[PDB]
Symmetry: C3
Subunit: 120 residues, 3 copies
């Protein structure tokens, strides 16, 4: 099983434990099956850091010119107003580049596992 | 006759036949003339379905790994107060991918026709 | 080789409303340098468009002004195409694509001093 496509659908406000935002991703799997999953920016950023660590060549850690993994701004750079809308635009681009990568990365178990529906 | 570039400019309320949103495309033709056209999301989605059926190979209908036509979430996936915004980001991606495809598809009459200025 | 100083990536972060000297919107870009350092810069759309026009003048071949089919410099809509109450928001998708395409151009262009200068931090 693998993912064919990820579309960023939007965000929603949540309030427990306190006010934050969750980004909604429409995940289409190999069998045309379709699921919406909900992730915080910080969780996505931790996912991205690990992805870079797993793929140093494609991360640009050896020759920076061979980098193909997309850039993702750290949380700190989304300061005040419009943080949700700002991060939404950034993630839409991040997701399309991510899914355009060679299958070595775009189907790695780290990615598949991040975007699988979480337990109730 | 053909399209060099399409840019998504935003969205606006139309009132005919009643209240809805329309997405604005700045269309640049071969002679560098630029025209804005106005299309509702449903109309774009119908364009996208038809394009797929016209191009089974490139749509991934014969062999899924050979697909190059971009993915577009169904209308049902967009609701809530930010539906119009949420579709905006999705359409920016779809279009750029759309005009990067070979001229068999990026210049097919079905596409040209779609982005031509409609009759008054 | 374009010297010891250049940009690896530019990301559009978003926009902010400014009130001085009067009501306008600036766009915030996160600029990553050769040493992987990152700075935020603030630029109004009119400034971006002038930068764009100058870029095209400097590189006629790559701007498709000789041969339209050889164009690699990205397209950018003129300021008059953005108006109404979502003008600020509406320019984002355009600017996001502009930035990524820019940074994928051959170094002769993507690290030309004009571009490098436009995205450097301005004096206080």
């Amino acid at each position: 099983t693998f993912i064919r496509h990820i579309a960023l659908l939007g965000f929603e406000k949540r309030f427990v434990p306190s006010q934050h935002y969750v980004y909604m991703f429409l995940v289409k799997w190999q069998d045309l099956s379709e699921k919406v999953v909900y992730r915080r920016f910080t969780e996505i950023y931790e996912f991205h850091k690990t992805l870079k660590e797993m793929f140093p060549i494609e991360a640009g850690a050896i020759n920076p010119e061979n980098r193909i993994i997309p850039h993702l701004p750290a949380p700190k750079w989304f300061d005040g107003q419009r943080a949700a809308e700002n991060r939404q635009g950034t993630l839409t681009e991040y997701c399309s580049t991510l899914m355009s990568l060679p299958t070595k990365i775009s189907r790695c178990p780290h990615l598949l596992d991040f975007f699988k529906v979480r337990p109730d």
